[PDB]
Amino acid sequence: MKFNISYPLTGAQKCIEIDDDKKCNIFMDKKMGQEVEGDTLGDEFKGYV
Amino acid sequence: RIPTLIRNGLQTKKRSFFVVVGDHAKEAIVHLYYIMSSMDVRQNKSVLWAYDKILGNTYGMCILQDFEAITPNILARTIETVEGGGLVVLLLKGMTSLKQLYTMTMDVHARYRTEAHDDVIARFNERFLLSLGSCESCLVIDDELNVLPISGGKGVKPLPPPDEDEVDQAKALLTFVDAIAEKTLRNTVTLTAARGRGKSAAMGVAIAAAVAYGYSNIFITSPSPENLKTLFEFVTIQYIRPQDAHVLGQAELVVIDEAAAIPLPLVKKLMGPYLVFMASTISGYEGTGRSLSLKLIKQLLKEITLSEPIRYAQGDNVEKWLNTLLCLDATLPRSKISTTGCPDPSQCELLHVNRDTLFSFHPVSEKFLQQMVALYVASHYKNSPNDLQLMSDAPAHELFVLTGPIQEGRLPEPLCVIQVSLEGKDLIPWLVSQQFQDDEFASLSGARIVRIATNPDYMSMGYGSKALQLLVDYDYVGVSYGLTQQLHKFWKRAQFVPVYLRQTANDLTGEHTCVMIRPLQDGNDPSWLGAFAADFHKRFLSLLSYKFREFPSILALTTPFDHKRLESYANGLLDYHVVLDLMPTIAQLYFTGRLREAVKLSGLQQAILLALGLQRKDIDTLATELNLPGSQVLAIFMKIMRKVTQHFGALVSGAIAAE
Amino acid sequence: TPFDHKRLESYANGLLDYHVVLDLMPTIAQLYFTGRLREAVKLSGLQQAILLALGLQRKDIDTLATELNLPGSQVLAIFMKIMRKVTQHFGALVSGAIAAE
Numbered sequence: 049m050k051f052n053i054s055y056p057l058t059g060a061q062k063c064i065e066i067d068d069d070k071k072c073n074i075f076m077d078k079k080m081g082q083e084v085e086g087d088t089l090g091d092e093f094k095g096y097v
Numbered sequence: 098r099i100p101t102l103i104r105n106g107l108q109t110k111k112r113s114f115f116v117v118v119g120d121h122a123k124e125a126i127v128h129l130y131y132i133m134s135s136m137d138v139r140q141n142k143s144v145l146w147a148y149d150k151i152l153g154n155t156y157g158m159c160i161l162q163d164f165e166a167i168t169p170n171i172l173a174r175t176i177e178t179v180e181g182g183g184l185v186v187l188l189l190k191g192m193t194s195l196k197q198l199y200t201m202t203m204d205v206h207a208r209y210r211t212e213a214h215d216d217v218i219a220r221f222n223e224r225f226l227l228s229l230g231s232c233e234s235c236l237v238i239d240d241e242l243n244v245l246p247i248s249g250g251k252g253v254k255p256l257p258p259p260d261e262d263e264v265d266q267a268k269a270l271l272t273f274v275d276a277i278a279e280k281t282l283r284n285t286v287t288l289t290a291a292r293g294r295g296k297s298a299a300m301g302v303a304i305a306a307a308v309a310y311g312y313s314n315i316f317i318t319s320p321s322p323e324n325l326k327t328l329f330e331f332v333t334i335q336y337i338r339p340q341d342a343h344v345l346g347q348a349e350l351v352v353i354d355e356a357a358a359i360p361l362p363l364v365k366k367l368m369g370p371y372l373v374f375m376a377s378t379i380s381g382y383e384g385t386g387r388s389l390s391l392k393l394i395k396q397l398l399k400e401i402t403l404s405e406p407i408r409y410a411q412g413d414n415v416e417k418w419l420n421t422l423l424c425l426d427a428t429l430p431r432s433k434i435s436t437t438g439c440p441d442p443s444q445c446e447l448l449h450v451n452r453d454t455l456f457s458f459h460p461v462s463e464k465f466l467q468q469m470v471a472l473y474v475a476s477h478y479k480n481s482p483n484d485l486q487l488m489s490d491a492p493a494h495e496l497f498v499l500t501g502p503i504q505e506g507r508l509p510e511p512l513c514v515i516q517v518s519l520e521g522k523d524l525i526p527w528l529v530s531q532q533f534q535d536d537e538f539a540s541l542s543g544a545r546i547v548r549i550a551t552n553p554d555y556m557s558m559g560y561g562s563k564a565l566q567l568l569v570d571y572d573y574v575g576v577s578y579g580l581t582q583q584l585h586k587f588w589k590r591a592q593f594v595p596v597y598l599r600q601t602a603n604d605l606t607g608e609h610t611c612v613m614i615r616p617l618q619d620g621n622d623p624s625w626l627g628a629f630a631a632d633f634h635k636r637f638l639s640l641l642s643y644k645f646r647e648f649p650s651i652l653a654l655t656t657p658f659d660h661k662r663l664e665s666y667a668n669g670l671l672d673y674h675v676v677l678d679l680m681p682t683i684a685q686l687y688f689t690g691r692l693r694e695a696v697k698l699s700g701l702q703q704a705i706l707l708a709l710g711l712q713r714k715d716i717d718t719l720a721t722e723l724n725l726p727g728s729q730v731l732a733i734f735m736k737i738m739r740k741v742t743q744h745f746g747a748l749v750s751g752a753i754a755a756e
Numbered sequence: 757t758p759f760d761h762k763r764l765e766s767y768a769n770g771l772l773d774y775h776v777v778l779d780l781m782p783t784i785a786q787l788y789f790t791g792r793l794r795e796a797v798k799l800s801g802l803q804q805a806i807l808l809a810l811g812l813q814r815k816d817i818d819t820l821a822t823e824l825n826l827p828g829s830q831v832l833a834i835f836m837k838i839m840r841k842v843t844q845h846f847g848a849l850v851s852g853a854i855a856a857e
Contacts, residue, residue, distance in 0.1 A: 071670060073731065085669055638789065641813065649813055651796070
């Protein structure tokens with residue numbers, strides 16, 4: 049699942065490729081615009097919403 | 098121009114490597130557009146663009162975009178797919194700049210290196226240049242080359258005409274295969290070959306060739322699937338996977354596709370009840386090491402091999418290129434090509450060498466590393482170039498070799514090798530934090546022993562441990578292996594401590610993967626080892642029950658932390674088994690929880706948590722009862738966990754969720 | 757529990773069957789958790805490692821008979837003996853009385 053992550057405040061357009069299955073598993077069965085806890089990305093996203 | 102040359106190529110049944118090197122837009126993109134219109138084996142070609150699903154199909158022409166990154170496995174696989182007259186267009190960065198290219202520009206494909214930023218991988222570029230430069234076979238088109246000379250092509254140009262391309266199998270199908278004799282007729286045959294040899298097609302023939310009623314009925318099994326498609330398409334073929342296969346015995350002749358991939362225990366039992374054709378791919382990407390193949394064969398075998406490719410003519414320069422680039426060649430197990438080779442006699446000597454050996458070509462050169470690679474690669478059940486790239490460019494790669502007599506420039510072969518891969522700051526450095534308790538575990542550094550191998554002639558000498566000692570000799574060392582009572586003691590004897598025992602039997606080995614650490618520094622690494630080890634201690638009952646196999650965790654040997662773990666499942670992505678087993682933190686939580694632990698709460702998917710954790714009810718079963726669409730089950734489990742924690746302590750859970 | 761002790765003695769001292777005491781963890785598994793002994797390779801609760809391999813591992817009767825090198829039927833006897841040993845280690849005086857009456 050590829051990610052088009054935008055950052056309001058500044059106008060930051062970034063694209064992340066997340067191949068491993070285990071991480072994305074949190075987006076499954078979630079509705080549009082819900083609050084994501086991007087800690088299922090221990091990598092560069094340590095404590096993100 | 099090249100279009101004429103393309104005509105020759107398809108007639109010959111060969112393929113060629115066309116390298117476009119230059120500016121991304123300039124040489125790469127525009128030329129690709131031009132080539133597509135121009136090069137028409139058929140009108141144009143399929144020109145599949147790669148930047149596993151693809152294999153059954155074949156395509157005329159393709160493009161591999163290495164401009165940013167080069168994933169070698171993908172390159173090798175892509176070539177195997179290409180039809181006769183096809184051209185593989187490799188898109189490269191400016192040639193002068195390519196080796197260094199990779200740094201800020203970096204090899205993006207650096208998923209081998211996995212540093213924060215991608216890097217150079219010069220060595221690989223150097224090896225690549227060597228093979229490419231060696232002969233005329235590959236066409237190099239560089240930018241700023243107004244005109245590129247094309248050897249071959251219409252008119253007189255370089256390319257000695259091969260014969261028009263258009264018996265080995267037939268000799269094999271029933272023929273070598275007629276197993277009737279004073280010796281048993283029923284036996285096990287094992288046909289091995291490189292990819293594209295026709296192993297499957299060969300295996301398909303026997304299916305009908307034996308007729309239901311008539312010759313007889315057949316059967317087929319395979320690991321995680323593999324393209325079942327060719328065999329059967331060439332085929333009564335029916336398929337029940339090995340485990341399900343374990344059910345009842347109907348057939349006269351069993352066929353197992355790439356059995357090497359299947360667990361020895363399961364495989365052996367099955368071979369006993371019937372007569373079989375054993376197929377296995379070697380000498381390629383995702384093949385099986387020939388060293389392991391022999392050990393596997395020994396367990397029995399009538400083995401046969403097929404040398405020529407169905408899809409192309411032998412001598413196809415594209416294929417030669419990839420083999421050489423990838424270091425497909427196996428020779429060291431039987432023997433080395435030199436005065437020495439084959440067994441490595443003499444006293445074994447332990448020594449370490451760095452990556453730098455890669456560039457120099459003299460004593461200690463490309464050859465030493467190449468030899469080490471061949472040995473480790475050969476001994477593994479699966480072979481992969483990712484390993485090769487890692488060995489070449491990746492930082493944090495350290496090797497130790499056990500070599501036989503050394504004197505002049507040329508001496509005998511290596512007895513053993515150890516490949517350490519720093520990790521930290523995949524496999525030992527990705528999971529200790531996902532699976533373990535400290536969020537921080539990912540931060541330190543350690544060297545995983547990715548691969549260790551001792552020549553079979555030399556084994557049980559102690560060289561293996563000798564290798565490890567040399568590694569430590571001059572935060573910790575780690576290893577992950579399929580758990581075996583035997584292998585564990587080896588590592589334990591090595592001074593490793595058992596860290597983790599996962600849930601899923603290795604698909605290949607059939608044993609559960611365990612992880613162990615050899616603490617180098619006391620500051621935090623022995624701490625992480627001991628802490629995990631203790632955690633495993635608490636978990637032990639949980640794991641054994643969960644295993645199903647329910648193997649007790651001996652490991653190499655004869656709470657507030659739980660709250661954190663629990664929050665991680667509830668608040669975040671951590672998976673169920675990690676928290677769950679029979680009773681890690683999750684079951685622990687259910688015991689305590691007053692809630693629906695039972696029909697709803699506890700820990701797991703079903704009654705959401707309890708029915709899976711306590712009951713061992715199926716995911717499908719609770720999805721129906723709970724009335725979830727699937728995937729949602731995990732979500733519900735997480736929600737259930739959150740609820741229980743809140744009931745236990747609202748304030749504590751809030752803080753944990755927060756940070 | 758004290759009731760567990762009685763049940764446990766009944767398996768060790770008498771004829772009560774394994775499943776009755778055993779399940780994943782009735783008194784028998786309960787005993788293995790507590791028992792320091794061979795609960796693992798030998799002790800615990802069940803036939804295999806005598807007790808543990810069957811109770812914890814779910815190993816087959818046939819499998820442990822070979823490892824343990826028992827003729828069959830004897831496995832149960834060994835399980836019983838293993839249970840007796842664990843109880844004694846826990847409390848010698850208590851077990852003696854229970855065996856007695």
